[PDB]
Amino acid sequence: GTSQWLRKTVDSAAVILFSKTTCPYCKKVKDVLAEAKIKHATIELDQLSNGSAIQKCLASFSKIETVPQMFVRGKFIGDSQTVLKYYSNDELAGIVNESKYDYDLIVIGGGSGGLAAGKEAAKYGAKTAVLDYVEPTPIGTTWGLGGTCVNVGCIPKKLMHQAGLLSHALEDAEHFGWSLDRSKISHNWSTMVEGVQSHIGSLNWGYKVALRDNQVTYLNAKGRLISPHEVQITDKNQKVSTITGNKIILATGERPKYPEIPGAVEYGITSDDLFSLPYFPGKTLVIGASYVALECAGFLASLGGDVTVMVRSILLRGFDQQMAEKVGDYMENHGVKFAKLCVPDEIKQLKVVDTENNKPGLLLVKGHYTDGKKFEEEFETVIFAVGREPQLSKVLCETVGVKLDKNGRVVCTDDEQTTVSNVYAIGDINAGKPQLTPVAIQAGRYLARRLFAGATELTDYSNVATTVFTPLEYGACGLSEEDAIEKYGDKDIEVYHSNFKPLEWTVAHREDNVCYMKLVCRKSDNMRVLGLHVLGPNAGEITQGYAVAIKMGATKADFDRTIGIHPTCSETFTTLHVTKKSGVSPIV
Amino acid sequence: GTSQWLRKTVDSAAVILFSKTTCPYCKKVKDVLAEAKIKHATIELDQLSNGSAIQKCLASFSKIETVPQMFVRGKFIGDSQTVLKYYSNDELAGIVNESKYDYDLIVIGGGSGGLAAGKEAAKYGAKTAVLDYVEPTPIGTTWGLGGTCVNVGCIPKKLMHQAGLLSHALEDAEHFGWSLDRSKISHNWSTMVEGVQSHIGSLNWGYKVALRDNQVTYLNAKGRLISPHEVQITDKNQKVSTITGNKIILATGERPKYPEIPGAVEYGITSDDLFSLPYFPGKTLVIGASYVALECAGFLASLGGDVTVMVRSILLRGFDQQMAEKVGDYMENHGVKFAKLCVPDEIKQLKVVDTENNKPGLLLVKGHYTDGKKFEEEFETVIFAVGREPQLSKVLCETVGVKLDKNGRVVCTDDEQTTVSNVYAIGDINAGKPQLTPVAIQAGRYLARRLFAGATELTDYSNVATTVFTPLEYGACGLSEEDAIEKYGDKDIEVYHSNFKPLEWTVAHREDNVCYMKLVCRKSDNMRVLGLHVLGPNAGEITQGYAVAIKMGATKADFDRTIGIHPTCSETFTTLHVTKKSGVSPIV
Numbered sequence A, B: 001g002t003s004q005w006l007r008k009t010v011d012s013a014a015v016i017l018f019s020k021t022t023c024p025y026c027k028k029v030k031d032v033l034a035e036a037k038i039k040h041a042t043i044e045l046d047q048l049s050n051g052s053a054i055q056k057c058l059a060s061f062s063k064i065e066t067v068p069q070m071f072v073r074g075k076f077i078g079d080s081q082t083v084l085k086y087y088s089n090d091e092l093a094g095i096v097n098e099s100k101y102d103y104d105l106i107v108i109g110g111g112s113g114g115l116a117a118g119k120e121a122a123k124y125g126a127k128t129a130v131l132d133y134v135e136p137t138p139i140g141t142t143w144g145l146g147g148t149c150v151n152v153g154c155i156p157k158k159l160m161h162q163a164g165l166l167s168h169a170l171e172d173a174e175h176f177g178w179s180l181d182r183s184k185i186s187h188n189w190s191t192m193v194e195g196v197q198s199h200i201g202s203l204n205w206g207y208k209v210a211l212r213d214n215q216v217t218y219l220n221a222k223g224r225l226i227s228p229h230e231v232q233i234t235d236k237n238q239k240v241s242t243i244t245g246n247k248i249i250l251a252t253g254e255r256p257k258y259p260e261i262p263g264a265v266e267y268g269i270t271s272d273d274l275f276s277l278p279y280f281p282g283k284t285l286v287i288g289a290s291y292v293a294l295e296c297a298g299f300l301a302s303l304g305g306d307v308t309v310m311v312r313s314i315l316l317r318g319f320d321q322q323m324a325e326k327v328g329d330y331m332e333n334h335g336v337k338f339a340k341l342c343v344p345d346e347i348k349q350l351k352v353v354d355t356e357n358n359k360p361g362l363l364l365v366k367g368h369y370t371d372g373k374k375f376e377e378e379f380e381t382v383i384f385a386v387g388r389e390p391q392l393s394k395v396l397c398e399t400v401g402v403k404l405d406k407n408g409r410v411v412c413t414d415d416e417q418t419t420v421s422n423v424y425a426i427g428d429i430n431a432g433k434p435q436l437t438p439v440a441i442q443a444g445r446y447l448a449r450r451l452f453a454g455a456t457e458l459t460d461y462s463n464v465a466t467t468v469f470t471p472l473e474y475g476a477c478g479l480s481e482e483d484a485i486e487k488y489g490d491k492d493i494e495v496y497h498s499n500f501k502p503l504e505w506t507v508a509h510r511e512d513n514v515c516y517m518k519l520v521c522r523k524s525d526n527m528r529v530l531g532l533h534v535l536g537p538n539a540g541e542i543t544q545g546y547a548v549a550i551k552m553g554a555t556k557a558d559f560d561r562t563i564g565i566h567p568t569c570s571e572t573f574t575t576l577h578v579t580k581k582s583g584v585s586p587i588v
């Protein structure tokens, strides 16, 4: 086992040094490498239980057994004397820059995973290039480096969530003694957008400065894998060229879907355009039922918009459906309208968008209900949030041999390898993995360490916690309640649950039995917690820490023997006692 | 072991039924007890691994070995036939109400632990009386049922913290696009106080309704333990009488200290009076450095007050002192003044409090610094937060034999027993235990189950998490950094740490490297997390869940292999990497 590991480590590392912590000849080579600004991986054999065998297996590559041993791209370079000799003779730089390929690593896609992979690999000497390019939306929207989350995702959408929550802060402030009158305050959309966009712009810039400071070539151009080690690039002026790389990481992500109906691409928008929209949407129709659909409808309504959501079948397919319905009911009771079991057939234009005065157009939406009734109504803006998909045919010449699934996502082993042995995929395009920014970062960074630093640690994709930032937030970790019953049988499942009420809602006179939380547990496994769910303020901050306990296999007794922090919302999890089978009510 | 347990269970239970889940004769006695409204404990022997031996040991008390067996106050009452016979003959009620004593349980003190103990014990048939009485403050302040937290503690102080935070919500709202101008909004103290007091009043009332619905006698009178089973009571009209009880729980809590200097009791106030003060404090001097001192100064300043804190030596003695100093520095940079290494000698009055117009008086404070300089300054209000202490000499006739320590707190074993075998203590008066409302609840409820339901589970007092609700909040669980070094040696301690910045602070243009968090770990124990610390918004909600992981013994690798929720503050704990020994900076 040790042997096979050392062979894979030596073959892929760019510059790697085997060492011991207490050896002056190792120090001597380290000081030489630091002086000449040579970046490299370092493995200290005296801090590995396996290191004595490893020190013996290095003689397969170098025919010696002492430390230090320096390797470049699979080739043994020398012990202490030879490296110093290479240095003294002005030979060391040309040896470490020697390669079959232009780059040790080419990343296609400069988003969450792409930039994480690229920065980490550069730290261990891997000569790295990150490629990024933003195909404009149908109306021409575009943005800078950083990928979906930074530019048209988690970041601008949580800040617009914050401004939505500040409306209820203003309401709440009257009851706590502040003098303002909420009903004489209005919201200015473009002022909000300028502040959000300004923060994004500093992220774009910060990422560029990060790549430059890690010696990463950044190319603003479209990448096409034409063979295992050859990537074709087309830049902004349509100039076409080829670069080669030893390892290839695919991190191109996804883009929004449009329903195939007349008028949709012409007259609707998506989340890609919403976050830099120069005008307030006005009376808005959201077509879709995903978490994207509900978060966007949610903050548009809190900023004073007239909002309808058109629901084909159910809300939040794939999430715990009781939690989904609580989520939806909260929105409906605070000014979001729902058009349930409704599908659109057509969008007709009645006014073009007023580019000069920054005012929305006007649209007519025709649809029908399953009961036969026609849907017909006017909206100033129509947003589509009906899914997302990758566009790999534009990236992957099918003759290279990368296996895709029926949805067009890349099939990988559990270390992210594709069916082409030097090509990997991370993030939203990795088939079957949760589509989330921290996941893609963990995958990129861990993969970079396996390739260029001999690491073994894999990314763990199970029981990853999520949060939906609807007006009342919803956090979950683990199995939904229905899936657990599905997997183990109703008799083996015990669900503890309770309503609650934040102390902050008392003086502000908000609802009594609306916030909610439950633990789904397995009876035959010491009451193991299979899934946790909470609906309430600050649901993300509440949920995060419990994810660590659940990863370690927490049981109902672990929740019970811990003591709460008071006064908090999250403490209700430490004193739960009402089961569902008992039939007792969860209310306060 | 089983034998000794069953003997203690039978001796103290009020009404307890031994049973099996699938026995129609058990059901038969259960249905009789439910019909006649007889409350009782029930132990189902078929759900205990030990139950076969237990069913054999019940023949020590009853000379039978079948189920069911009913016991009242240590006496075997009958199997199925005898109970039905007692019922049919109109004899059952007088048998279950038979006792040497008026009450199975007398609780002295109606606060967090007292009410928790009393409600739980009543569920298992224990005939219970809760005693509560609020000795007025020197200026005559007083309040209703519920104890310190409800009336003059965690509840009114977190709501006044919420109103303090709403000031920065109002500031923040401008940058997110809302139209208001913070500099034209002022705060009305008495309007805030009315809303806080109204919520407390519904808690007072709710607790009374709770005791009545659990058949608990509630006496509004001062309790004095004169012998192991005799409590003397003095009511509001000074009428004096005696009641007897089998078990006694002491839950009288503490009250604030005053420094022995001239003018202090006459002209200063404490937290006991602050939370219902009919006038705004105005320019205020806080004398003390505890968490009470800083939380109160904190919200007074955010509500527009001119505030000074007088610090004898250090802030927050007993907390991680780096975290304390970060906490203090934040306050100082946002309008709280600190008078460091300063002690008061005297308070002179310059104006009496204006009772009619609701306006504060005016005071002169004289003190001196350790460098020799005199302190002399005028304040409209002086608050003392210089400690809290119990008053057990007013409760415990020293001839009863309850051992106190040098601070006047009750010495108990790890199941809360005092040196008098039927007397227990819970909450702030239990010597050596964290003085916290959830602890006192856990202790009361678990004790009630041991006494009257045969439970064995003890309360776990280690690694209880805390939060300090200063303007920037501070949450901790486990060891402070200095104590861990003290216990295991610097060489064996590794501290990971990082600054961070909430996404919400970006658009509102707040500080860059002020929020902070660290993990204190032990090198020789798989990098076990010994202590966690975070300074930032919503610190309580952040910290709570990690307390569960730490109780199960989380390591640095458990934090690493869990994936974050994004965008949150709490996710920074899942990706920490900068150690202190490395000397790398923690900034962004």
Ligand SMILES: Cc1cc2nc3c(=O)[nH]c(=O)nc-3n(C[C@H](O)[C@H](O)[C@H](O)COP(=O)(O)OP(=O)(O)OC[C@H]3O[C@@H](n4cnc5c(N)ncnc54)[C@H](O)[C@@H]3O)c2cc1C
Binding pocket: A108, A109, A110, A111, A112, A113, A114, A131, A132, A133, A134, A135, A146, A147, A148, A149, A150, A152, A153, A154, A157, A221, A222, A223, A224, A251, A252, A253, A254, A271, A292, A394, A395, A426, A427, A428, A429, A435, A436, A437, A438, A440, B566, B567
């Ligand atoms: C509205 C919305 C809200 C979201 N909110 C959250 C949230 O709160 N939390 C969360 O965890 N996740 C959230 N997500 C998901 C999260 O953003 C993604 O999981 C994450 O962006 C995936 O990262 P990635 O690196 O795999 O892809 P991306 O971030 O999409 O990066 C891919 C990049 O590669 C570029 N590219 C594509 N093809 C090429 C090519 N041929 N050559 C060069 N460059 C190319 C793309 O234009 C893009 O810049 C949200 C997503 C959306 C749409």
Ligand SMILES: Cc1cc2nc3c(=O)[nH]c(=O)nc-3n(C[C@H](O)[C@H](O)[C@H](O)COP(=O)(O)OP(=O)(O)OC[C@H]3O[C@@H](n4cnc5c(N)ncnc54)[C@H](O)[C@@H]3O)c2cc1C
Binding pocket: A566, A567, B108, B109, B110, B111, B112, B113, B114, B131, B132, B133, B134, B135, B146, B147, B148, B149, B150, B152, B153, B154, B157, B221, B222, B223, B224, B251, B252, B253, B254, B271, B292, B394, B395, B426, B427, B428, B429, B435, B436, B437, B438, B440
């Ligand atoms: C300003 C302040 C803020 C706090 N904030 C928090 C916080 O955020 N979180 C937290 O966990 N803890 C907090 N605490 C501490 C928390 O309130 C206590 O730990 C808790 O109240 C202890 O409960 P107890 O039942 O032991 O005592 P108490 O709640 O003090 O109850 C004792 C009761 O018995 C009464 N009594 C006394 N003697 C007699 C007698 N002879 N006869 C009858 N009745 C009698 C007392 O008047 C009182 O009503 C705070 C405390 C203070 C002072």
Ligand SMILES: CSc1nsc(NC(C)=O)n1
Binding pocket: A287, A288, A289, A290, A310, A311, A312, A313, A342, A343, A344, A385, A386, A387
């Ligand atoms: C993929 S979720 C989704 N797709 S269409 C829809 N709603 C409509 C057509 O009204 N929801």
Ligand SMILES: CSc1nsc(NC(C)=O)n1
Binding pocket: A168, A169, A172, A471, A472, A473, A502, A504, A505, A536, A537
């Ligand atoms: C979810 S909508 C809403 N309004 S106030 C709030 N939460 C607080 C004050 O903690 N939520």
Ligand SMILES: CSc1nsc(NC(C)=O)n1
Binding pocket: B287, B288, B289, B290, B310, B311, B312, B313, B342, B343, B344, B385, B386, B387
């Ligand atoms: C017990 S903490 C404390 N006691 S006195 C003080 N400060 C002063 C005298 O100025 N802090």
Ligand SMILES: CSc1nsc(NC(C)=O)n1
Binding pocket: B168, B169, B172, B471, B472, B473, B502, B504, B505, B536, B537
């Ligand atoms: C701690 S003082 C302060 N002002 S705003 C804030 N926190 C947010 C907006 O999450 N804290």
